[PDB]
């Protein structure tokens, strides 16, 4: 598709990688790897192409793991949004899509808003929403 993209963190030089419904980590960026492909399927949901499941969290808490859930427009736990300067996080909360703290391989929700909570569409200087609908 054209809506498809890789989620990139400039500081680590790595892209998000869907390993399984309960596991979403990072890997060296490869535009040909299905597991690294995602796409917005609505104004607030991003779906992993390889799994046809939407990025989400069990609850809106600090250090909650970001994994894959059956896409559901009504779930308030799989809704994301773009903050300022590529900072990305859960819609309506000050918790960010984060990677890099504590040797934790899975994507986590984190309170910090530094370089590790900022993501861009691989191949651009744009935030994730540039590939979205809103």
UniProtKB/Swiss-Prot annotation:
* Role, per record: Mediates the endocytosis of glycoproteins by macrophages. Binds both sulfated and non-sulfated polysaccharide chains. Acts as phagocytic receptor for bacteria, fungi and other pathogens.
The gene it comes from is Mrc1
Which cysteines pair up through disulfides? They are: 15-29, 54-71, 82-129
Expression induction per the record is: Down-regulated by interferon gamma.
Which part of the chain is the Ricin B-type lectin domain? 2-122
**Tissues of expression:** Detected in macrophages.
UniProt subcellular location: Endosome membrane; Cell membrane
Residues annotated as glycosylated are 84
Which superkingdom? Eukaryota
Q: What is this protein called?
A: Macrophage mannose receptor 1
Give the organism, scientific name. Answer: Mus musculus (Mouse)
Query: What residues of the intact protein does this structure contain?
Result: 21 to 154 of 1456
């Amino acid at each position: 598709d054209a809506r498809q993209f890789l989620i990139y963190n400039e500081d680590h030089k790595r892209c998000v990688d869907a390993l399984s419904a309960i596991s979403v980590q990072t890997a060296t960026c490869n535009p040909e790897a299905e597991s690294q492909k995602f796409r917005w399927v609505s104004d607030s949901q991003i779906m992993s192409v390889a799994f046809k499941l939407c990025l989400g969290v069990p609850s809106k808490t600090d250090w909650a793991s970001v994994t894959l859930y059956a896409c559901d427009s009504k779930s308030e736990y799989q809704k994301w949004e773009c903050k300022n300067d590529t900072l990305f996080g859960i819609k309506g909360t000050e918790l960010y899509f984060n990677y890099g703290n504590r040797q934790e391989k899975n994507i986590k929700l984190y309170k910090g808003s530094g370089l590790w909570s900022r993501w861009k569409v691989y191949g651009t200087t744009d935030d994730l929403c540039s590939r979205g609908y809103e």
